[PDB]
């Protein structure tokens, strides 16, 4: 009821990876009930980025997921006040990232305040050498841990030379308003894709389709 079938999205990300500082703006639209969104991104400071753009893409909102009637939708029930999430990303060669997003809504627009910090990526590894191609489609497991809604996903970045580079996500999600009821455990399938880009990934168009289910 707060959430319309078509919503606009505004975003700013600030961050630092291996010491490199950057600022990225996003402008997008999506369909919350169909689980589809896309976004145009533009690096404003720090470009051309010296690391694989792909590590950032899942930090650029689980409101855009199709939920069936039989699973409580914690994210759509969080609005208009909104919610926040914090994520750790643990890569198999020791790279580590922490990201957060604080999401608010004004009228027909979501605003996103995103922070992304990464460290310990080996200078000779696929992230700093820009050898990544895409994330594989994934399944996030949603459950409650110590009273907090938690999503785990085992992610894989396809690399040049048909190898995958693995990363474990853990995200915690918290409604701003007390007493939004927690859902039962469930799954969210995701597919995220870079649809287009320019030479050094200073301008990128991103898309995600996500669908909640019970297994």
Residue numbers in the entry: 2 to 61, 65 to 219
Any passages from the paper?
The mGeos series of rsFP’s display similar switching behavior to Dronpa. The series was developed from mEos2, with mutations that remove the undesirable irreversible green-to-red photo conversation, increase fluorescence brightness and provide high thermal stability of the off-state. Skylan-NS represents a further improvement, with reduced per cycle bleaching and higher photoswitching quantum yield in the on→off than Dronpa. We present high resolution room temperature SFX structures of Skylan-NS in both ‘on’ and meta-stable ‘off’ state collected using two different XFELs, the SPring-8 Angstrom Compact free electron Laser (SACLA), Japan and the Linear Coherent Light Source (LCLS), USA.
We collected datasets for the dark on-state using two different methods at the SACLA/EH4 station using the DAPHNIS chamber. Firstly, by using the grease injection method, we selected relatively large crystals of 50–100 μm in size. Diffraction was collected up to 1.9 Å resolution with diffraction still present in the corners of the detector. The hit-rate could be carefully controlled with the crystal density, and levels of 40% could be sustained with crystal densities of 4.8 × 107–9 × 107 crystal/mL. Table 1 shows the CC* and R-split values that reveal data from the droplet method was lower quality than that obtained from the grease injection method. The comparison between the two on-state structures collected with the grease injection and droplet methods under the same conditions (Black) showed the lowest R-factor over the intermediate resolution range up to ≈3 Å resolution. An increase of the R-factor for the increased resolution (<3 Å) is likely indicative of genuine structural differences between the grease and droplet methods, in agreement with the observed degradation of R-split and CC* when merging intensities together (Black). The dehydrating effect on the crystals due to the mother liquor being replaced with a mineral oil–based grease matrix in the grease injection method could explain this difference. Following complete refinement of all four datasets, both on-state structures showed no statistically significant density in either the 2Fobs-Fcalc or the Fobs-Fcalc maps that could be assigned to a trans chromophore structure. The same was observed for chromophore omit maps, that also, at lower sigma levels, did not show such density. This is in agreement with the dark incubation and dark sample injection which corresponds to a 100% on-state concentration. Photoisomerisation is clearly seen in a comparison of the “on” and “off” refined structures where the dihedral angle of the chain connecting the phenol ring to the rest of the chromophore (N–C=C–C) changes from 1° (cis) → 171.1° (trans) in the on- vs the off-state and the pheonolic oxygen is displaced by 6.2 Å.
